[PDB]
């Protein structure tokens, strides 16, 4: 959501040979993606 | 392009001496004065030029299918917008349905 | 899958097994490492070496061009198209500002005036200064004006070229090629510059 | 409240320091030796640290702010 506010006040200054479009999607996919921290609810919930 | 006088079709443009000269098949020679030094053109970045948009960006407001922002509008004070982005610049424009749209345009 | 990264369902082992060649290729990369080895230890000095090496041609900094049946002379009033009338304007000021940049004697009756992305500019960073000793590097055979580096926004900055009368007499023997085309070829090669 | 002011400085700084990052306030790519640019004042060891020496950070974007700005605000319109 962050990112997006970023937009809206344009705050997203994408680097040389990046486009904004290609930029704000590269920043969304890396935002997505979940830590390594989300076996720590999925190992406590199982006995090995 | 030149519309011939006597029988409005499309004149044929040639170069002689320093000139423009538009010969037509029915004879008739007419030399352009200066809105016909015009040879080519072309324009770049069409898919994201304001007069792409002008329609859509008038119609967005009342457009359901819109995404809506929690912000007020400035000159009618209704608290809700319509935003938009365009561009390959993602290019953020908020218009209300009084007339306000951002960038001042 | 993208132009230019296009490793999608099989592309790559048919540009190897057909031996396809170098300009059918929709996944070609390189790598290229420093000269210098205490370069390579840095980032930022690797940083701005990769985006000196970038192809940026004269097109993509083009919004819009126009192809002009004009001459320029400084004292004669010529016959100029009334929607780009305003550009004298800055005319004048480029004749005061480069006492050494005098318009040739054998400027030929073609005009191409330009209109720059503003924008491109910023975000490659690329200045007025470096744009037009690029094409006067390039193509002795015109004469290039230009207009003031603005910082306003609204006020766009205009490159306007002079085709010299010796950009056609490279080959004229060739007569399959009215005035027109060469014109027409020439603005070709200075996009593609 | 701390936090939010905090990350909105950082933030900031960040984007002033990856849009200045090779590109040069001066035109062009930034020029460096004995690890400072020529055309400008940037140090090597600013852009991606602002927090060991912050008076150097706090002087270079004090040269080229509203420069910045200004190229913030023309890339974000038509
Ligand atoms: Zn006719
Ligand atoms: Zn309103
Ligand atoms: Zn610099």
Redesign the pocket.
Do not use: F, L, P, W
């Given at each position: 959501e962050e990112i997006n506010n970023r937009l809206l006040h344009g705050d997203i200054m994408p680097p040389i040979g990046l486009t904004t479009h290609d930029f704000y999607e590269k920043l969304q996919l890396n935002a997505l993606k979940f830590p390594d921290r989300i076996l720590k609810p999925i190992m406590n919930s199982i006995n090995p | 392009m030149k519309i011939?006088?006597?029988?409005?079709?499309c004149?044929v443009r040639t170069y002689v001496d320093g000139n423009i000269i538009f010969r037509?098949?029915?004879?008739?020679s007419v030399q352009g004065d200066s809105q016909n030094l015009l040879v080519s053109s072309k324009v770049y970045h069409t898919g994201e030029m304001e007069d792409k948009y002008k329609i859509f960006i008038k119609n967005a407001p009342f457009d359901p299918t819109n995404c809506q922002i929690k912000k007020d509008c400035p000159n009618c004070h209704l608290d809700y917008l319509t935003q938009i982005c365009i561009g390959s610049q993602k290019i953020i424009i908020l218009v209300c349905r009084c007339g306000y749209m951002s960038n001042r345009g | 899958v993208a132009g230019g990264t296009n490793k999608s369902g099989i592309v790559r082992p048919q540009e190897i097994f057909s031996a396809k060649p170098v300009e059918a290729e929709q996944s070609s990369e390189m790598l290229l490492r420093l000269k210098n080895p205490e370069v390579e230890t840095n980032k930022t000095y690797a940083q701005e070496i990769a985006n000196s090496i970038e192809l940026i041609t004269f097109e993509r900094l083009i919004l819009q061009w126009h192809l002009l049946y004009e001459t320029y002379s400084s004292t004669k009033k010529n016959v100029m198209y009334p929607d780009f009338a305003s550009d004298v304007e800055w005319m004048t000021d480029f004749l005061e500002n480069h006492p050494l940049l005098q318009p040739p004697e054998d400027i030929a009756n073609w005009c191409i005036r330009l209109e720059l992305n503003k924008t491109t500019m910023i975000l490659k960073s690329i200045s007025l200064e470096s744009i037009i000793n690029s094409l006067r590097a390039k193509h002795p055979n015109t004469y290039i004006m230009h207009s003031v580096e603005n910082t306003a926004s609204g006020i766009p900055i205009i490159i306007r070229i002079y085709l010299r009368e010796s950009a056609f007499r490279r080959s004229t023997n060739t007569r399959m090629a009215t005035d027109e085309k060469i014109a027409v070829n020439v603005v070709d090669k200075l996009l593609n510059s | 409240k701390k936090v939010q002011t905090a990350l909105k400085a950082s933030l900031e700084f960040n984007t002033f320091y990856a849009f200045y990052e090779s590109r040069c306030p001066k035109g062009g790519l930034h020029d460096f030796q004995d690890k400072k640019c020529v055309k400008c004042g940037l140090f090597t060891y600013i852009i991606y640290d602002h927090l060991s020496q912050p008076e150097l950070v706090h002087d270079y974007y004090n040269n080229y702010k509203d420069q910045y700005d200004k190229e913030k605000m023309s890339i974000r319109s038509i």
């Open positions: - | 011939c006088k006597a029988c409005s079709s004149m037509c098949s029915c004879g008739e | - | -």
